[PDB]
Structures are given as structure tokens and as C-alpha cells.
Design a protein around this ligand. Sequence first.
Ligand SMILES: Cn1ccc2cc(N)ccc21
Ligand SMILES: Cn1ccc2cc(N)ccc21
Lengths: 195, 195
Amino acid sequence: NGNSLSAAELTCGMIMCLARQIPQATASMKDGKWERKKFMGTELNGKTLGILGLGRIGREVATRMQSFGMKTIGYDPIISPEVSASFGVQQLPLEEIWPLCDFITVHTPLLPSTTGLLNDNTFAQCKKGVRVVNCARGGIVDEGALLRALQSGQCAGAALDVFTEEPPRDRALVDHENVISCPHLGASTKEAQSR
Amino acid sequence: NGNSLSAAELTCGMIMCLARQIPQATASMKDGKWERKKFMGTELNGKTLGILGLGRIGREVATRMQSFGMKTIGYDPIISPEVSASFGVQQLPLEEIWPLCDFITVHTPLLPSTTGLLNDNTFAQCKKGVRVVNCARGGIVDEGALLRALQSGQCAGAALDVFTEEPPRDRALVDHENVISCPHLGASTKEAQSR
Ligand SMILES: Cn1ccc2cc(N)ccc21
Ligand SMILES: Cn1ccc2cc(N)ccc21
């Protein structure tokens, strides 16, 4: 609540990082390389962002990404479509969301219904090259499924602030060239800490 | 013109990268580490962003960063203050700008007046801990001065897409822990390439 904006900002930063590969570019540059072709990226303007979970953080993500000309769609079983309309998010059933999304971001608790919200069945229904963000709770994105999706190219990149186990003991995601990551920094700001 | 949104989008990415140290955090995770204290960051909401150069790219940065609640101030020799106000940028003489800014971003051409726009004189007029972005042209930020300001703490972080020499021959800037960088990727998007 006091940390909604810290979470929402981190999420939007991860979205920009997946579009432009800024973390990977910095690593390259620090290793003395000048790799222009490798880090050809994409524009956010005109892309579709799916927001799973339309509480405080999700809404704050939406209105920030709207300023980039992203089309913002989403799903929340609790929040009315009239409330989500108020902040520019079209609610759609999940089955409709997957095929539309260039980017998908998750803003849910960890429940039975949301553990593996993104899993092999839902990755399959996504547009090829979807990019995924999890700054919410470890386990919302099935980590096995995500790796399989990165391996095939069904998922073109992922940004993870949270893991099923913290620190993650399985390193295959964190080591993947298309994965950007942080050690659960969503609420690690001077402001969130200090009310 | 085509490439203005690519540049503006990178610049905003750089700004969020600087606020939450996302490239350094990924590098630390990739080094097998879980260092959360080290990467305590800052909220963008409420902070002041100084934009030097209020052209197309500068405007586009402003309206995106306005959605994060950033106060947007700036300077441009040509653009009148009532026109900048119409896109949310409060124009002030440079002398007024330096002490006010949490972040500064340059969007100027490279001219005698803008080469070393940021230099030892102007850095010492800044607020301690200012964060700086150059996705415009190498040399607008004097690189020697920026290094000294990073070494003292007067500058808390910088994000560079461009260098006085490309690739950079001098390495101290790129190698600094608080500097994030890319190999001149501001126009390197599929969309910008394609027309
Ligand atoms: C299955 N699922 C998808 C989004 C979402 C949000 C909440 N609050 C609960 C469950 C959810
Ligand atoms: C000295 N200076 C500061 C900002 C700026 C913009 C332009 N286009 C030219 C010169 C400038």
C-alpha cells in the first residue's frame, strides 16, 4: 500500500529492460564489448500489455505504461470491469488475454488459482515471443514452464524479481541470457522503508 | 523523427535503471549472489527530472516521466515557457535547474554551447547524489567531470548510451559500479529500422 508505487515502478523498469536489454547491454559494455547488432530491441509504443491482477499495483502499472502508448488489457476476478475501465484497462477472460499480449505482467497473491498462472498450457496460447514480468510472488510463473518457453523462443525474455525459492537454488533461469533479475527488490526503496 | 520514440523510450528506461540499479542487480544475481541491502533504490514519484533540450525527444520523455509523478523542469534556448508549459515542463534558466534536480537528461545537439553542458562547475551546482542520463550525443556530459562527480558521490549514478569516442577507448566511466551503459542503442529498434 505504502509500497504500491515502489512495486509498480520496478515493474515498469523491468518492462523497459526487456524491450531494450539494458542489463545485458551494460554487462557487455563492462566486458569491453561493443555489440550493436546483438541488442537490437523493440519499441513499447503500440504493443499490448496484459495485466493479471488489477489492484493498486496493477492499476499504477497500467496508467504508467499507457503514457508509453501501450494498449493495456487485463483480468481480475474480484475487480469490476467498470473500475478497471476507470483506469484504462479492458477486462477480458484469461483465455482471451494470452493471444493478444506482447508483454504480460502479474500482480496477484500466490493462491492455488495463481500458482503456475503462467505454465506450459498458458505459454502455448501466448503469441510467440511474448515477454513476461513477475515482480509479485515467486511461483506465479511456473519456473520450469518459463525455461521451456525461453528455450524454444515462445517466450523471448523474462524479468523476475521473485522466485519459487529465494535465493533460487536452481540457476537455469537466472543464468539465461534473456532473463533479467533482481534479489526481490520490489519494495527496496528508501521511501517504502521509511514512512 | 521516426527514431524519436526509440530514443525517448531508452532514456526513460535508463532513468528507471538508475533509480533501482537493475543492471547491477542482474549482474549480481548472475554472479551467484543475493545482495539485497546493496541495491536499495529510490522512488521516482515526487522527484524532479531536469530535461535539457525540449525538442521532440525531450517532450516525449517528459510526458512519459510525468506519469510516474515526476516533476518535469527544463531548459531550451528557443522554446518559449508557455509552449513548454503546454507539455508539462516548467522552463527555468540553467542556473536555477541544477540545484533542483534528482535526475537530469540531455536532449540537445552537440554544439560549442552544449559540449560539456555538464562539467565540473555545473556538477558542483547540482544537488548531492544527482543521477544523470545521456542518450543524446557523446560529449554533452564532460566525461572527466562525470567521472570525478561519480568518484566523490556528487553524482550518484549515470546512464550513457553515447561516448566522446565510440567504442569508448577510455574505460573508467563504463567500468564504474554506478554507471550503466549501452553501445549507442537509442535508435536500435526493429520499428525504428523499418518504415
Ligand atoms: C487467477 N487470477 C488471475 C488474476 C488474479 C487476481 C487475483 N486477485 C486472484 C486470482 C487471480
Ligand atoms: C546550451 N543548451 C542547453 C540546452 C540546449 C538546447 C539546444 N537545442 C541548444 C543549446 C542548448
